[PDB]
Amino acid sequence: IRGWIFGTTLDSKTQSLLIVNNATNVVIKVCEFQFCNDPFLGV
């Protein structure tokens, strides 16, 4: 689990809560500029 997305449209077109975890750190954004909408990272 890299994290979560929450919202109504869930696609940054409407306001879209993005949550990500890296090491013990947590990084959060709500923005409309498109995310890593493809979730991929190579394990």
Partner 1 sequence: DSFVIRGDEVRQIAPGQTGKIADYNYKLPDDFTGCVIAWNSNNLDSKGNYNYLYRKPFERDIYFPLQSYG
Partner 2 sequence: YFKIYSKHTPINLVRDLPQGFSALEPLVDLPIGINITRFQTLLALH
One-letter identity of residue 31: C
Residue 31 touching partner 2 (CB under 8 A): no
Query: Residue 21 forms beta bridges with which residues?
Result: 26
- 42 contributes a contact to partner 2 by CB under 8 A: yes
Q: Is 2 within 8 Å of 20 (Cβ atoms)?
A: yes
Give one word for 39, left, alpha or beta, with left for phi > 0 and alpha for psi -120 to 50. alpha
Query: Could you give the string, one character per residue 1-40, with x where binding to partner 1 holds by CB under 8 A and - elsewhere?
Result: -------x----xxx----------------x--------
Binding interface with partner 2 (CB under 8 A): 1-10, 15, 17, 20, 28, 30, 36, 39-43
